Design a protein around this ligand. Structure first.
Ligand SMILES: [Ca+2]
Ligand SMILES: [Ca+2]
Ligand SMILES: [Mg+2]
Ligand SMILES: [Mg+2]
Lengths: 37, 48, 258, 156, 188, 96
């Protein structure tokens, strides 16, 4: 029980961290691409 | 004179003639906005 | 939370008032906000208000307390609050009682933490003066008081000067989006016009170097922006300029002009 | 008590709805007629709210001059945003349509305090917007003037 | 060949559930005591909170899936209640247990996401939904591991019906007070 | 009142709505109505308030359909003059 719950917690945390890092990178690139014509 | 927008007749765009007097406001029209002779334009005076 | 600002909203808290405030605050046309809205009222919310708060799960919090009680102010962390927005009951039986209650709320908040910025509403001008006489209240650091009667009468007087200016200003300071009407009616032109909001931006060095009409017409023709310690309204003959534009993205290019 | 220091101000005692009083002041030859209600907040109930403003607006619209009264510039204050549908008899009234899309509001013939609330949001994001609005409608209301009017409660 | 049931063991599932509950509670309390006088996380927390509420299209999809799968889990509990209380059932034959496996995996992932999105972890631990997640999924995992089934605290799946009012409120389906009250009363 | 309506089953219909709400007027098909009769509370504590409410009802009905005959009961003469001050009220086509 606790092992599965910890596995799910870690999986969700890792997925959220990866997705938010990807979102931050995409935001940085789309803000940098706006300055040049 | 710094012009904000125009005060255009409600039935100005309609082809059918009418005696309506009410007018609606248009704020910051574009550069290429078509203009009608029956208009009043909001603007500013620099004089005491 | 570190890096996450928050503001405390108190006063006349109802379903309609909170709904309007959240519609105006967390607007789609508004840029991406990063502040939390913490409501503090002494009456528990209804089922409809609870559902409305549940819709804004990660952006709106509610805490039951009294503004006059310092413990409730400490609970909502008013010391670290970015601002405190005090809402007023504009449709009250007598404006004197509501204005006096707002005075008491401002007095209590400034008593707890005098360095906080307060935005409040007023129904009479003399109550605004009474607020101006508070020791901790200073207007240079950000404290503001929107007087409903004063502003509405100013709008009406300006409309008496040029008819239709009151609705121009009302649509100008209200956040809205872009709507296209297929039918060739007056509503299409009106909705094209209403899509303009008001922004502020720092002008470039070249703009500061030149004269006001020159930079204004240069912004209007090239940048397609209408550019409107004191505030100078359309002067004659580095600095903050007031622009009218569809969104802040178009205003931002004024600083970046070469 | 707060108006004696302003030139060219006159007072006509009487009902603002009587036709003789409005004809005496030549309401047809005027820049604007502003219908204001002082005790409009007391009346609680839409079935008993904003009777006088609408009735006076219709009365002025129905006048005949040796021209008609529908050309008189009129602005009316309202406290119920749904009462704007009775100001004009030509538009398509609808309780679902919000105020700013209503024809009297688009024409500048109606006003309500319900449109100023959003100012708070703007006032939070840019207080320069509030100071620009204040300095544009009141004609350069400087803060030194605010302090002076706070002290003497009058104009010197 | 469709044999019968013999020896009776049930402390495995209940013990696993009690461990999953009390061990986590004790870890939270120990962390709090250690933090007491020393005796990017916000970003992922906000993302999880947006996911939980129907703020994004994927959020609405997750909410609708939660609704449908809670209903399905209740129906599966009914079907299993038609069976004997203690039985032996191999994983690969009956199609009910794989469906229960998928349902419990989804519910475990949903619980993990809700924990990530929670403000106060201790008070989140003592929640009805969290409790019924503690006493339902570990028993199912133990049952599929041991190839034997016990009708344990599976009725707690019905307690998943309480969150229906909040689920509908998130999807902007319930707006009025009377309908909200009716849904709350009926679900409870 | 329900019993009284049932007694006149084929002659009388009842509907719930407000004269101030245009949707309610659209429900009762007032644009095709021959006339609109507005009853008044003769034994009212404040006759001025009742007259103002009746004037408001007339204003709403004329706003929705300005070409309908309206017969109304009025308690004061000055309020009657105000009623005739309405732009759409004309006595030549049957408005009394
Ligand atoms: Ca706007
Ligand atoms: Ca109308
Ligand atoms: Mg929060
Ligand atoms: Mg019949």
């Amino acid at each position: 029980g606790p092992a599965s719950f910890l596995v799910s917690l870690a999986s969700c945390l890792a997925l959220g961290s990866g997705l938010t890092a990807c979102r931050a990178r995409r935001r940085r690139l789309r803000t940098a691409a706006l300055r040049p014509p | 004179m710094l012009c904000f927008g125009i005060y255009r007749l409600r039935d100005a765009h309609l082809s059918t003639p009418s005696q309506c007097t009410k007018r609606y406001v248009i704020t910051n029209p574009p550069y290429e906005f078509e203009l009608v002779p029956t208009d009043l334009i909001f603007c500013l005076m620099q004089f005491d | 939370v570190s890096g996450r600002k928050h503001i405390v909203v108190c006063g006349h808290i109802t379903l309609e008032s909170v709904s309007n405030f959240l519609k105006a605050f967390l607007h789609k046309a508004r840029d991406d906000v990063n502040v939390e809205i913490v409501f503090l009222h002494n009456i528990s919310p209804n089922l409809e208000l609870e559902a409305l708060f549940k819709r804004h799960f990660t952006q709106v919090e509610f805490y039951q307390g009294s503004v006059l009680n310092p413990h409730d102010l400490a609970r909502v962390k008013i010391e670290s609050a970015d601002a405190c927005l005090i809402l007023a009951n504009k449709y009250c039986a007598d404006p004197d009682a509501e204005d006096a209650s707002n005075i008491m709320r401002v007095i209590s908040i400034k008593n707890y933490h005098p360095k906080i910025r307060i935005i409040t509403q007023m129904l009479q001008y003399h109550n605004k003066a009474h607020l101006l006489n508070i020791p901790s209240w200073n207007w240079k650091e950000g404290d503001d008081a929107i007087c409903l009667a004063e502003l509405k009468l100013g709008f009406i007087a300006q409309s008496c000067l040029a008819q239709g200016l009151s609705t121009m200003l009302a649509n100008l300071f209200s956040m809205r989006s872009f709507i296209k009407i297929e039918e060739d009616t007056w509503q299409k032109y009106y909705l094209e016009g209403v899509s303009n909001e008001m922004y502020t931006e720092y002008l470039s060095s070249a703009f500061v170097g030149l004269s006001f009409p020159t930079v204004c017409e240069l912004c209007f023709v090239k940048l397609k922006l209408l550019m409107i310690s004191r505030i100078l309204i359309n002067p004659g003959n580095g600095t903050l300029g007031f622009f009218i534009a569809s969104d802040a993205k178009e205003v931002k290019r004024a600083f970046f002009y070469c | 008590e707060t108006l004696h220091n302003f030139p060219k101000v006159s007072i006509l005692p009487g009902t603002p709805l009587s036709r003789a009083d409005l004809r005496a002041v030549n309401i047809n030859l005027c820049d604007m007629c502003v219908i204001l209600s002082a005790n409009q907040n007391n009346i609680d109930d839409t079935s008993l709210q904003d009777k006088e403003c609408i009735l006076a607006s219709l009365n002025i619209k129905s006048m005949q001059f040796d021209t008609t009264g529908v050309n008189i510039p009129i602005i009316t204050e309202l406290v119920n945003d749904t009462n704007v549908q009775f100001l004009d008899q030509d538009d398509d009234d609808d309780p679902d349509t919000e105020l700013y899309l209503t024809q009297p509001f688009a024409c500048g013939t109606a006003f309500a305090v319900s449109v100023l609330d959003s100012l708070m949001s703007a006032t939070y994001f840019n207080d320069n917007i509030l100071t620009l609005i204040r300095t544009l409608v009141t004609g350069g209301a400087t803060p030194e003037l605010e302090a002076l009017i706070a002290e003497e409660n009058a104009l010197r | 060949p469709c044999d019968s049931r013999g020896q009776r063991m049930w402390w495995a599932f209940l013990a696993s559930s009690m461990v999953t509950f009390f061990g986590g509670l004790f870890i939270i309390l120990l962390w709090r005591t250690l933090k007491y006088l020393w005796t990017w996380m916000t970003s992922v927390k906000d993302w999880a909170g947006v996911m939980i509420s129907a703020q994004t299209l994927t959020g609405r999809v997750l909410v609708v899936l939660v609704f449908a799968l809670s209903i399905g889990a209740l129906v599966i509990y009914f079907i299993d209640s038609s069976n004997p209380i203690e039985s032996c059932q191999n994983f690969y034959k009956d199609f009910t247990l794989q469906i229960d496996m998928a349902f419990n995996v989804f519910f475990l992932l949903y619980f993990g996401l809700r924990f990530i999105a929670a403000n106060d972890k201790l008070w989140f631990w003592l929640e009805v939904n969290s409790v019924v997640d503690f006493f339902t999924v570990p028993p199912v995992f133990v049952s599929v591991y041991l190839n034997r089934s016990w009708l344990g605290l599976r009725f707690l799946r019905a307690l998943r019906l309480i969150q229906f009012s909040e689920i509908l409120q998130f999807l902007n389906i319930l707006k009025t007070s009377n309908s909200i009250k009716l849904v709350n009363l009926l679900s409870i």
